[PDB]
């Protein structure tokens, strides 16, 4: 064989590439920095009114508005400073697995195991959420829906590949094929120019939303990547797996940074998110509880415990000001 | 309190959603959600008809004050199991499976695994699975081509019809780890009438009573 | 949209009228609506209040108990049922919607109001005038003052600027101080603090002529300002 052997070349002198300059690790340089001490976060609101499971969360881009999405078929906005519902919608498949909100406040997506990224108007004339454009052209269940613009939206699916869509007409513009099983999840980048996908084969991949390319691949775990967001920066990423590992990895190094995983870990991570400053790296997991990790130095500075069930959602708001979790036992808890 | 005259509002807006959507709730509790479930090539043109008649496919019926939904498995194609913890809180899993199941050409560590890993899942180990066996067309027409050495090594005797079909049972109940919290149903019938929605009316009533019972903290 | 009344005439003192608002192409089951009136060649007065749902209901002193407010939200059909009517209660009245979340816009639409004739502690808004000549193309600033501080401990300073363009029904343009309203035209801007609030109108085109009026939200009953007529 020739292009096997030439393939086999490339990826082991790439990595060779990788390793011979590889200086050191994280922890080697930033271990005499000092810790953070026990970020004992306080339960300030209580969001309560769903009764199914929690899949999805998304805050809204003043820091104020939520979205969540349940196993119920409920959509609920709210008003997280009041703890006061600023919408409810009706969707039509209750098997809805992940929501997004509108970076403009303007729109809302929301989709699952009917393959169909709904696309919801909230300021309307009439006063009602119609439908605005339902997004169809999927062949399995749809995971991370993510605005880019009031026109444009990405969604992973399991059909090993996420898709660009085009709200204004309908189609599928750019379609990113390259993973070999479900892609559970995608964040969109800061700066809304890139992308990165976690699936079930035990990788992720950064791609261009752009140009359709297969830019990066990142492996490290053994098992599927259930969640992932960005550094607030833009320039690294951190997934987490049924490892029980969340892993830090740069989009630059082309490596894992560092590993987040305790020995007394029995289950495996949820949700993953992160602090305004990128200090706390947080992480819902599947025995009850959140964990706030700090970043640098990967010890467990805080447990956010209340959550009767499985934390399935976690996010930070744009300026910071607070935690969302939301899990199993129908209850968005806010955390200051 | 020190709310002004548009929070006032805003608290009336958001009571008046809560009030929808527990009244709403109270609907989405009261109906059934069957999970179905089959093999390969087993047959399921010929229940969903006997019924009172893309993504995930929904099958609605109501029968005797009870909302049936069914949500069918000849929707997904993923085999990677990541659909199934969405199915929780679904009142019982509708299981078929026939005795023709080895016409399509090994059943035995292909299902035996599937019900190893349905045991090994802790979502599906708590809830009832109810069984079919349905028809009588063809399930005594090809148990006498042979002795069933060529693919099932466990057992090695005589096979008649129902004495093996009483083996099956035992031997499915040997599938189960823990019969302490799951609870099987099955079913040896002639699917020729309505007797096929009368094991999946009372299978799934004694689900319903005894979730009720365990609800109350009654037994 | 479409909000249309019903139910204007001549009538004498001592009798009873109803006035119905009927609405086409909105969720009227999702708005409160408001009353409105505004007395001929004077200025504007709000009258009452109805939440969604039926729950809240507020009038205006002056003929509180003395009006009654009905609503039909699965036929959408807003009544206001007067029982006595003197000759301050001719009016043309205007029914409004209303919607109270998080970032509304809630005295958005104006009704075409309907013409009633009858023969023969609350918070003042001040107008500083009453006519100001200008042409087309110079910047005009409007004011007006209120008695408290319409800033509240929410950060949010409930003042509403409508324009009334003269034949028609009224319009909001600002709904707390710097929000332009729903497809106004953004030339419009409006600024203050506490209880001087100002209305900037730079590059003035023709049709943006009309009665000014500065109202506040903040508490019931609402108080609208005596009305800046901008000419030319």
């Known amino acids: 064989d020739q292009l096997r052997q030439e393939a086999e070349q490339l990826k082991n002198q790439i990595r060779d590439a990788r390793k011979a300059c590889a200086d050191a690790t994280l922890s080697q340089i930033t271990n005499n920095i000092d810790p953070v001490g026990r970020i004992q976060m306080r339960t300030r609101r209580t969001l309560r009114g769903h009764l199914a499971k929690i899949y999805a969360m998304h805050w809204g881009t003043d820091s104020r508005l939520l979205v969540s999405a349940s196993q119920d078929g409920k959509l609920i906005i709210w008003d997280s400073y009041t703890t006061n519902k600023v919408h409810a919608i009706p969707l039509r498949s209750s098997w809805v697995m992940t929501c997004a909100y509108a970076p403009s406040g303007n729109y809302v997506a929301c989709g699952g195991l009917d393959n169909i990224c709904s696309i919801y108007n909230l300021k309307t004339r009439e006063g009602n959420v119609r439908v605005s454009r339902e997004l169809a052209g999927h062949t399995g269940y749809l995971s991370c829906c993510r605005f880019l613009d009031d026109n444009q939206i990405v969604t992973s699916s399991g059909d090993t590949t996420c898709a660009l869509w085009d709200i204004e007409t309908g189609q599928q513009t750019t379609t990113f094929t390259g993973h070999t099983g479900d892609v559970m999840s995608l964040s969109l980048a800061p700066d809304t120019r890139l992308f990165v996908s976690g699936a079930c084969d035990a990788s992720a991949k950064l791609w261009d939303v752009r140009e359709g390319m297969c830019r990066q691949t990142f492996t490290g775990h053994e098992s599927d990547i259930n969640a992932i967001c960005f550094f607030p920066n833009g320039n690294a990423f951190a997934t987490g797996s049924d490892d029980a590992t969340c892993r830090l990895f740069d989009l630059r190094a082309d490596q894992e940074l560092m590993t987040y995983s305790h020995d007394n870990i029995i289950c495996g991570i949820t949700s993953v998110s992160f602090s305004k400053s990128g200090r706390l790296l947080l992480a819902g997991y599947d025995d009850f509880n959140c964990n706030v990790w700090d970043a640098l130095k990967a010890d467990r500075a805080g447990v956010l415990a209340g959550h009767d069930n499985r934390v399935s959602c976690l996010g930070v708001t744009d300026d910071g000001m607070a935690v969302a979790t939301g899990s199993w036992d129908s209850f968005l808890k806010i955390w200051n | 309190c020190t709310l002004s005259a548009e929070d006032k509002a805003a608290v009336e807006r958001s009571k008046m959603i809560d009030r929808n959507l527990r009244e709403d709730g109270e609907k989405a509790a009261r109906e059934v959600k069957l999970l179905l479930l089959g093999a390969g090539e087993s047959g399921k043109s010929t229940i969903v008809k006997q019924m009172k008649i893309t993504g995930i496919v929904e099958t609605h019926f109501t029968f005797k004050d009870l909302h049936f939904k069914m949500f069918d498995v000849g929707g997904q194609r993923s085999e990677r199991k990541k659909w199934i913890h969405c199915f929780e809180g679904v009142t019982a899993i509708i299981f078929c499976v026939a005795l023709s199941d080895y016409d399509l050409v090994n059943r035995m560590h292909e299902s035996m695994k599937l019900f190893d890993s349905i045991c090994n899942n802790k979502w599906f180990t708590d809830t009832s699975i109810i069984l079919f066996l349905n028809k009588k067309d063809l399930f005594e027409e090809k148990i006498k081509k042979s002795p069933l050495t060529i693919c099932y090594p466990e057992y090695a005797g005589s096979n008649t019809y129902e004495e093996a079909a009483a083996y099956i049972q035992c031997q499915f109940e040997d599938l189960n780890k823990r019969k302490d919290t799951k609870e099987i149903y099955t079913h040896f019938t002639c699917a020729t009438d309505t007797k096929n929605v009368q094991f999946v009316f009372d299978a799934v009533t004694d689900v319903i009573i005894k979730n009720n019972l365990k609800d109350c903290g009654l037994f | 949209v479409q909000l249309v009344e019903s139910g204007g005439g001549l009538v004498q003192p001592g009798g009873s009228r109803k006035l119905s608002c009927s609405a086409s192409?909105?969720?009227?089951?999702?708005?409160?609506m408001h009353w409105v009136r505004q007395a001929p060649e004077k200025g504007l007065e709000w009258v009452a209040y109805?939440?969604?749902?039926?729950?809240?209901?507020y009038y205006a002193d002056t003929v509180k108990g003395r009006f009654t407010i009905s609503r039909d939200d699965p036929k959408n059909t807003l009544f206001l049922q007067m029982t006595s009517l003197r000759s301050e209660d001719t009016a043309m009245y205007y029914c409004?919607?209303?919607?109270?979340?998080?970032?509304?816009?809630?005295?958005?639409?104006w009704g075409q109001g309907t013409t009633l004739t009858v023969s023969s502690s609350d918070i003042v808004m001040t107008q500083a005038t009453s006519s100001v000549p200008v042409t087309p193309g110079e910047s005009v600033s409007i004011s007006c003052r209120s008695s408290?501080?319409?800033?509240?401990?929410?950060?949010?300073?409930?003042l509403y600027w409508f324009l009334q363009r003269p034949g028609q029904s009224p319009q909001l343009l600002i709904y707390?101080?710097?929000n332009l309203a729903s497809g106004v035209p953004d030339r419009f801007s409006g600024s203050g603090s506490g209880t001087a609030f100002t209305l900037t109108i730079s590059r003035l085109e023709a049709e943006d002529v009309g009665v000014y009026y500065c109202?506040?939200?903040?508490?019931?009953?609402?108080?609208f300002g005596a009305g800046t007529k901008l000419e030319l």
């Open positions: 409004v919607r209303s919607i109270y979340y998080y970032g509304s816009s809630p005295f958005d639409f």
């Open positions: 192409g909105f969720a009227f089951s999702s708005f409160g």
């Open positions: 109805i939440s969604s749902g039926s729950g809240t209901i």
């Open positions: 408290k501080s319409l800033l509240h401990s929410n950060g949010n300073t409930y």
């Open positions: 707390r101080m710097s």
């Open positions: 109202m506040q939200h903040l508490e019931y009953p609402l108080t």
